[PDB]
Coordinates of N, CA and C and ligand atoms in Angstrom, one line a residue:
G87 N 0.9 -1.2 0.0 CA 0.1 -0.1 0.1 C 0.9 1.3 0.0
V88 N 0.2 2.4 0.2 CA 1.0 3.6 0.1 C 0.7 4.5 1.3
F89 N 1.8 5.1 1.8 CA 1.9 6.1 2.8 C 2.2 7.3 2.2
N90 N 1.3 8.4 2.5 CA 1.5 9.7 2.0 C 2.0 10.8 3.1
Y91 N 3.0 11.4 2.7 CA 3.5 12.6 3.7 C 3.7 13.7 2.9
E92 N 3.2 14.9 3.3 CA 3.2 16.1 2.7 C 3.9 17.1 3.7
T93 N 4.8 18.0 3.2 CA 5.3 19.1 3.9 C 5.5 20.3 3.1
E94 N 5.9 21.3 3.8 CA 6.2 22.6 3.1 C 7.4 23.2 3.7
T95 N 8.2 23.9 3.2 CA 9.2 24.7 3.7 C 9.5 26.0 2.9
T96 N 10.0 26.9 3.4 CA 10.1 28.2 2.8 C 11.7 28.4 2.4
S97 N 11.8 29.1 1.3 CA 13.2 29.5 0.8 C 13.2 31.1 0.6
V98 N 14.3 31.7 0.8 CA 14.6 33.1 0.5 C 15.1 33.3 -0.9
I99 N 15.1 32.2 -1.7 CA 15.5 32.4 -3.2 C 14.1 32.3 -4.1
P100 N 14.2 33.2 -4.9 CA 13.0 33.2 -5.8 C 12.8 31.9 -6.6
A101 N 11.6 31.6 -6.8 CA 11.3 30.2 -7.3 C 12.1 29.8 -8.7
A102 N 12.1 30.6 -9.7 CA 12.8 30.3 -10.9 C 14.2 30.0 -10.7
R103 N 14.9 30.7 -10.0 CA 16.3 30.6 -9.6 C 16.6 29.3 -8.8
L104 N 15.7 29.1 -7.9 CA 15.8 27.8 -6.9 C 15.8 26.7 -7.9
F105 N 14.8 26.8 -8.7 CA 14.4 25.5 -9.4 C 15.6 25.3 -10.5
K106 N 16.1 26.3 -11.0 CA 17.1 26.2 -12.0 C 18.4 25.6 -11.2
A107 N 18.8 25.8 -10.0 CA 19.9 25.4 -9.2 C 19.6 24.2 -8.5
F108 N 18.6 24.0 -7.6 CA 18.4 23.0 -6.8 C 17.9 21.7 -7.5
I109 N 17.0 21.9 -8.5 CA 16.5 21.0 -9.5 C 17.3 20.7 -10.7
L110 N 17.5 21.7 -11.5 CA 18.2 21.5 -12.7 C 19.7 21.4 -12.7
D111 N 20.3 21.9 -11.7 CA 21.6 21.6 -11.6 C 22.1 21.0 -10.3
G112 N 21.2 20.2 -9.7 CA 21.4 19.5 -8.4 C 22.6 18.5 -8.3
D113 N 22.8 17.8 -9.6 CA 23.8 16.8 -9.5 C 25.2 17.4 -9.3
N114 N 25.4 18.6 -9.8 CA 26.6 19.4 -9.5 C 26.6 20.0 -8.3
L115 N 25.6 20.7 -7.8 CA 25.5 21.5 -6.5 C 25.4 20.5 -5.4
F116 N 24.8 19.5 -5.3 CA 24.7 18.9 -3.9 C 25.9 18.4 -3.4
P117 N 26.8 17.6 -4.3 CA 28.1 17.2 -3.7 C 29.1 18.4 -3.4
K118 N 28.9 19.5 -4.0 CA 29.8 20.6 -4.0 C 29.4 21.4 -2.7
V119 N 28.1 21.7 -2.6 CA 27.7 22.6 -1.3 C 27.4 21.7 -0.1
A120 N 27.0 20.4 -0.2 CA 26.7 19.6 1.0 C 27.4 18.3 0.9
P121 N 28.8 18.1 0.8 CA 29.4 16.9 0.8 C 29.3 16.0 2.0
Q122 N 28.9 16.5 3.1 CA 28.7 15.8 4.1 C 27.4 15.3 4.4
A123 N 26.5 15.6 3.3 CA 25.1 15.0 3.2 C 24.9 14.1 2.0
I124 N 25.5 14.6 0.8 CA 25.6 13.6 -0.5 C 26.9 13.7 -1.0
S125 N 27.7 12.4 -1.1 CA 28.9 12.4 -1.4 C 29.1 12.6 -3.0
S126 N 28.2 11.9 -3.8 CA 28.2 12.2 -5.3 C 26.9 11.8 -5.8
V127 N 26.8 12.4 -7.2 CA 25.5 12.0 -7.9 C 25.9 11.4 -9.4
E128 N 25.6 10.3 -9.7 CA 26.0 9.6 -10.9 C 24.9 9.6 -11.8
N129 N 25.1 10.0 -13.0 CA 24.0 9.7 -14.0 C 24.2 8.6 -14.7
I130 N 23.3 7.7 -14.5 CA 23.4 6.2 -15.1 C 22.9 6.2 -16.4
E131 N 21.8 6.7 -16.8 CA 21.0 6.6 -18.2 C 20.2 7.9 -18.1
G132 N 19.9 8.5 -19.4 CA 19.2 9.6 -19.7 C 19.8 11.0 -19.6
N133 N 19.1 11.9 -20.0 CA 19.6 13.3 -20.3 C 19.1 14.3 -19.2
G134 N 18.2 13.8 -18.2 CA 17.6 14.5 -17.4 C 16.1 14.6 -17.4
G135 N 15.4 14.1 -18.4 CA 14.1 14.1 -18.5 C 13.5 12.7 -18.0
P136 N 12.1 12.6 -18.0 CA 11.5 11.3 -17.7 C 12.3 10.0 -17.9
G137 N 12.4 9.2 -17.0 CA 13.2 8.1 -17.3 C 14.7 8.1 -16.9
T138 N 15.3 9.2 -16.7 CA 16.6 9.3 -16.3 C 16.9 8.6 -14.9
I139 N 17.9 8.0 -14.8 CA 18.3 7.3 -13.5 C 19.6 7.9 -13.0
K140 N 19.6 8.1 -11.8 CA 20.9 8.6 -11.0 C 21.0 7.7 -9.8
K141 N 22.4 7.7 -9.5 CA 22.7 7.0 -8.3 C 23.3 8.1 -7.2
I142 N 22.5 8.3 -6.2 CA 22.9 9.3 -5.2 C 23.6 8.6 -4.1
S143 N 24.7 8.8 -3.8 CA 25.6 8.2 -2.7 C 25.7 9.2 -1.5
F144 N 25.9 8.3 -0.3 CA 25.9 9.1 0.9 C 27.2 8.9 1.6
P145 N 27.6 9.9 2.4 CA 28.9 9.7 3.0 C 29.0 8.4 3.9
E146 N 30.2 8.0 4.1 CA 30.4 6.9 5.2 C 29.8 7.2 6.5
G147 N 29.2 6.3 7.2 CA 28.7 6.4 8.5 C 27.1 6.6 8.4
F148 N 26.6 6.9 7.3 CA 25.2 7.2 7.0 C 24.4 5.7 7.2
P149 N 23.1 5.8 7.5 CA 22.4 4.5 7.6 C 22.6 3.7 6.2
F150 N 22.4 4.4 5.1 CA 22.3 3.9 3.9 C 23.4 4.3 2.8
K151 N 23.9 3.4 2.2 CA 25.0 3.8 1.2 C 24.7 4.6 0.0
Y152 N 23.6 4.3 -0.6 CA 23.1 4.9 -1.9 C 21.8 4.8 -2.0
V153 N 21.0 5.4 -2.9 CA 19.8 5.2 -3.7 C 19.9 5.4 -5.1
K154 N 19.1 4.7 -5.8 CA 18.9 5.1 -7.2 C 17.6 5.7 -7.5
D155 N 17.4 6.9 -8.2 CA 16.2 7.4 -8.5 C 16.0 7.5 -10.0
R156 N 14.7 7.5 -10.3 CA 14.4 7.8 -11.6 C 13.4 9.0 -11.7
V157 N 13.8 9.8 -12.8 CA 13.0 11.1 -12.9 C 11.6 10.6 -13.6
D158 N 10.5 11.2 -12.9 CA 9.3 10.9 -13.5 C 8.6 12.1 -14.5
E159 N 8.9 13.3 -14.0 CA 8.3 14.5 -14.7 C 9.0 15.7 -14.4
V160 N 9.2 16.6 -15.3 CA 9.9 17.9 -15.0 C 9.0 18.9 -15.7
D161 N 8.5 19.9 -15.1 CA 7.7 21.0 -15.6 C 8.4 22.2 -15.2
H162 N 9.0 22.7 -16.2 CA 9.8 24.0 -16.3 C 8.8 25.1 -16.1
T163 N 7.7 25.1 -16.5 CA 6.7 26.3 -16.3 C 6.3 26.5 -15.0
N164 N 5.7 25.4 -14.4 CA 5.3 25.4 -13.1 C 6.2 25.0 -12.0
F165 N 7.4 24.8 -12.2 CA 8.4 24.4 -11.3 C 8.2 23.1 -10.5
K166 N 7.8 22.2 -11.2 CA 7.4 20.9 -10.6 C 8.5 19.9 -11.0
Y167 N 8.8 18.9 -10.1 CA 9.8 17.9 -10.4 C 9.4 16.7 -9.5
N168 N 9.0 15.6 -10.3 CA 8.6 14.4 -9.8 C 9.7 13.3 -10.0
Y169 N 9.9 12.4 -9.1 CA 10.9 11.4 -9.1 C 10.7 10.3 -8.3
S170 N 11.2 9.1 -8.5 CA 11.0 8.0 -7.6 C 12.3 7.3 -7.1
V171 N 12.5 7.0 -6.0 CA 13.5 6.1 -5.5 C 13.1 4.8 -5.7
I172 N 14.0 4.0 -6.5 CA 13.5 2.7 -7.1 C 14.5 1.6 -6.8
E173 N 15.7 2.0 -6.1 CA 16.6 0.9 -5.7 C 17.6 1.4 -4.6
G174 N 18.2 0.4 -3.8 CA 19.1 0.9 -3.0 C 18.6 1.3 -1.6
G175 N 19.5 1.3 -0.5 CA 19.3 1.6 0.6 C 17.9 1.0 1.2
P176 N 16.9 1.6 1.5 CA 15.8 1.1 2.2 C 14.8 0.2 1.2
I177 N 15.1 0.2 -0.1 CA 14.3 -0.4 -1.0 C 14.8 -1.8 -1.0
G178 N 13.8 -2.7 -1.0 CA 13.9 -4.2 -1.0 C 12.6 -4.8 -0.6
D179 N 12.8 -5.9 0.2 CA 11.5 -6.7 0.4 C 10.3 -6.1 1.2
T180 N 10.5 -4.8 1.7 CA 9.4 -4.1 2.5 C 9.0 -2.8 1.8
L181 N 9.9 -2.3 1.1 CA 9.7 -1.0 0.5 C 9.9 -1.1 -1.0
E182 N 8.9 -1.0 -1.8 CA 9.1 -1.1 -3.3 C 9.7 0.1 -4.0
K183 N 9.1 1.3 -3.6 CA 9.5 2.6 -4.2 C 9.0 3.8 -3.2
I184 N 9.6 5.0 -3.5 CA 9.3 6.1 -2.9 C 9.1 7.0 -4.0
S185 N 7.7 7.6 -4.2 CA 7.4 8.5 -5.2 C 7.3 10.0 -4.6
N186 N 8.2 10.8 -5.0 CA 8.3 12.2 -4.6 C 7.8 13.2 -5.6
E187 N 7.3 14.2 -5.1 CA 6.8 15.4 -5.9 C 7.3 16.7 -5.2
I188 N 8.0 17.5 -6.0 CA 8.4 18.8 -5.4 C 7.8 19.9 -6.2
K189 N 7.2 20.9 -5.7 CA 6.6 22.0 -6.4 C 7.2 23.3 -5.8
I190 N 7.8 24.3 -6.6 CA 8.2 25.4 -6.0 C 7.4 26.6 -6.4
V191 N 6.8 27.3 -5.5 CA 5.9 28.5 -5.7 C 6.5 29.8 -5.2
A192 N 6.3 30.8 -6.0 CA 6.7 32.2 -5.6 C 6.0 32.7 -4.4
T193 N 6.7 33.6 -3.6 CA 5.9 34.2 -2.6 C 6.2 35.8 -2.9
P194 N 5.4 36.7 -2.4 CA 5.6 38.1 -3.0 C 6.8 38.9 -2.4
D195 N 7.3 38.4 -1.1 CA 8.4 38.9 -0.8 C 9.8 38.7 -1.5
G196 N 9.6 37.9 -2.5 CA 10.8 37.4 -3.4 C 11.5 36.1 -2.9
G197 N 10.7 35.4 -2.0 CA 11.2 34.1 -1.7 C 10.4 33.2 -2.4
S198 N 10.2 31.9 -1.8 CA 9.5 30.8 -2.3 C 9.1 29.8 -1.3
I199 N 8.2 29.0 -1.7 CA 7.8 27.8 -0.8 C 7.8 26.5 -1.6
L200 N 8.5 25.6 -0.9 CA 8.6 24.3 -1.6 C 7.6 23.4 -1.0
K201 N 6.7 22.7 -1.9 CA 5.7 21.7 -1.6 C 6.2 20.6 -1.9
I202 N 6.3 19.6 -0.9 CA 6.8 18.3 -1.0 C 5.8 17.2 -0.7
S203 N 5.6 16.3 -1.6 CA 4.8 15.0 -1.3 C 5.8 13.8 -1.4
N204 N 5.9 12.9 -0.3 CA 6.6 11.7 -0.3 C 5.6 10.6 -0.3
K205 N 5.6 9.6 -1.1 CA 4.6 8.5 -1.0 C 5.4 7.2 -1.0
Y206 N 5.5 6.5 0.1 CA 6.1 5.2 0.3 C 5.2 4.1 -0.2
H207 N 5.7 3.3 -1.2 CA 5.0 2.1 -1.6 C 5.5 0.9 -1.0
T208 N 4.8 0.2 -0.2 CA 5.3 -0.9 0.8 C 4.7 -2.1 0.0
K209 N 5.5 -3.4 0.3 CA 4.9 -4.6 0.0 C 4.4 -5.2 1.2
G210 N 2.9 -4.9 1.2 CA 2.1 -5.5 2.2 C 2.1 -4.7 3.6
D211 N 2.4 -5.6 4.5 CA 2.9 -4.9 6.0 C 4.3 -4.7 5.5
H212 N 4.9 -3.7 6.3 CA 4.5 -3.0 7.5 C 4.5 -1.7 7.3
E213 N 4.7 -0.8 8.4 CA 4.3 0.7 8.4 C 5.6 1.6 8.3
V214 N 5.2 2.7 7.9 CA 6.0 3.9 7.8 C 5.5 5.1 8.7
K215 N 6.2 5.2 9.7 CA 5.7 6.4 10.7 C 6.4 7.7 10.6
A216 N 5.6 8.8 11.0 CA 6.1 10.1 10.8 C 7.4 10.3 11.4
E217 N 7.8 9.7 12.5 CA 9.0 9.9 13.3 C 10.1 9.5 12.5
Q218 N 10.1 8.4 11.7 CA 11.1 8.0 10.9 C 11.3 8.8 9.6
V219 N 10.2 9.1 9.0 CA 10.0 10.0 7.8 C 10.9 11.4 8.1
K220 N 10.9 11.6 9.4 CA 11.8 12.9 9.8 C 13.1 13.1 9.2
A221 N 13.7 11.9 9.0 CA 15.0 11.8 8.3 C 15.0 12.4 6.9
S222 N 14.0 12.0 6.3 CA 13.8 12.5 4.9 C 13.6 14.1 4.9
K223 N 12.7 14.5 5.8 CA 12.6 16.0 5.9 C 13.9 16.7 6.4
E224 N 14.6 16.2 7.3 CA 16.0 16.7 7.7 C 17.0 16.8 6.6
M225 N 17.0 15.8 6.0 CA 18.1 15.7 4.8 C 17.7 16.7 3.7
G226 N 16.4 16.8 3.4 CA 15.9 17.8 2.4 C 16.2 19.2 2.9
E227 N 16.0 19.6 4.2 CA 16.2 20.8 4.7 C 17.6 21.1 4.6
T228 N 18.5 20.2 4.9 CA 19.9 20.4 4.8 C 20.5 20.8 3.6
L229 N 19.9 19.9 2.5 CA 20.2 20.2 1.1 C 19.8 21.6 0.8
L230 N 18.5 21.9 1.0 CA 18.0 23.2 0.8 C 18.8 24.4 1.2
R231 N 19.2 24.4 2.5 CA 19.9 25.5 3.1 C 21.3 25.5 2.6
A232 N 22.0 24.5 2.3 CA 23.3 24.6 1.6 C 23.2 25.2 0.3
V233 N 22.1 24.8 -0.6 CA 22.0 25.5 -1.9 C 21.6 26.9 -1.7
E234 N 20.7 27.3 -0.8 CA 20.5 28.7 -0.6 C 21.7 29.5 -0.3
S235 N 22.5 28.9 0.9 CA 23.7 29.8 1.2 C 24.6 30.1 0.0
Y236 N 24.8 29.0 -1.0 CA 25.5 29.2 -2.1 C 25.1 30.2 -3.1
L237 N 23.6 30.1 -3.3 CA 22.9 31.1 -4.0 C 22.9 32.6 -3.5
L238 N 23.0 32.6 -2.2 CA 23.1 34.1 -1.7 C 24.5 34.7 -1.8
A239 N 25.6 33.7 -1.8 CA 26.9 34.1 -1.8 C 27.4 34.3 -3.3
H240 N 26.8 33.7 -4.3 CA 27.2 33.8 -5.7 C 26.0 34.3 -6.4
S241 N 26.0 35.5 -6.6 CA 24.8 36.2 -7.2 C 24.6 36.1 -8.7
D242 N 25.8 35.7 -9.3 CA 25.9 35.5 -10.8 C 25.5 34.2 -11.1
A243 N 25.3 33.3 -10.2 CA 25.0 31.9 -10.5 C 23.6 31.6 -10.7
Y244 N 23.2 30.9 -11.8 CA 21.8 30.6 -12.1 C 20.8 31.8 -12.2
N245 N 21.3 32.8 -12.8 CA 20.4 33.9 -13.5 C 20.3 33.6 -15.1
Ligands
DXC442 C1 16.7 17.3 -5.7 C2 17.1 16.1 -6.4 C3 16.6 16.2 -7.9 C4 17.5 17.0 -8.8 C5 18.7 16.2 -9.1 O1 18.6 15.1 -9.5 O2 19.8 17.0 -9.4 C6 16.6 14.9 -5.8 C7 16.9 13.6 -6.6 C8 17.0 12.5 -5.6 C9 16.6 13.0 -4.2 C10 17.1 12.2 -3.1 C11 16.5 10.8 -3.1 C12 16.8 10.1 -1.7 C13 16.2 11.0 -0.5 C14 14.6 10.8 -0.6 C15 14.0 11.7 0.5 O3 12.6 11.6 0.5 C16 14.5 13.1 0.6 C17 16.2 13.2 0.6 C18 16.7 12.4 -0.4 C19 18.3 12.3 -0.2 C20 16.5 13.0 -1.8 C21 17.0 14.4 -1.8 C22 16.7 15.3 -3.1 O4 15.2 15.4 -3.2 C23 17.1 14.4 -4.4 C24 18.7 14.5 -4.2
DXC443 C1 12.1 6.3 7.1 C2 12.1 5.8 5.7 C3 11.3 4.5 5.5 C4 12.0 3.2 6.0 C5 11.0 2.1 6.0 O1 10.2 2.2 7.0 O2 11.1 1.2 5.2 C6 13.4 5.7 5.0 C7 13.4 5.4 3.4 C8 14.2 6.3 2.6 C9 15.2 6.7 3.5 C10 16.2 7.8 3.2 C11 17.0 7.4 2.0 C12 18.0 8.4 1.6 C13 18.9 8.9 2.8 C14 19.9 7.8 3.1 C15 20.7 8.3 4.2 O3 21.8 7.2 4.5 C16 20.0 8.6 5.5 C17 18.9 9.8 5.2 C18 18.0 9.2 4.1 C19 17.2 10.6 3.7 C20 17.1 8.0 4.4 C21 16.2 8.4 5.6 C22 15.1 7.3 5.8 O4 15.8 6.2 6.4 C23 14.3 7.0 4.9 C24 13.5 8.2 4.5

């Protein structure tokens, strides 16, 4: 079955620029700006569109070594990015896939809001609790804040 978790978080970076950096150049940015969260991003197959597969590796001592994701949809107009975690780490005999959706919306102060849906697809039993899903949220926030800091300091990047 499916467990759905939704959250929102704010950014001080305008939506289009954040989308260009965090989404469209994340493979480069994350290992650069948050190497103690993501050690590397490997493009396995594809050009970035639907079906593209990447391997996201984590630093030594993290609970999981890597995951592979597959890009599901990229909406450059509405700043939407959907992808699925389809192998590695927690994926196996209890968890079949994690389907995620990110949407970035502009706020009038010149910042943005990220609207996130995480859907865990399990094989029958058992359960995915909010407390454990906190690790997803924490990692996501760490990556966002690292990218934000870079974009604040490098004003010529991703305009
Ligand atoms: C933001 C990129 C997409 C852009 C890109 O591939 O460069 C996506 C692609 C894969 C994503 C990761 C997949 C595994 C994790 C899923 C969790 O539920 C949230 C944290 C992690 C660590 C995700 C963080 C982030 O949401 C990533 C890194
Ligand atoms: C808590 C869920 C669900 C686990 C289950 O019940 O099967 C699992 C599934 C995907 C897991 C994430 C995969 C990517 C990351 C791997 C890191 O090495 C530790 C942080 C992250 C962000 C993990 C945190 C957490 O361990 C998650 C979010």
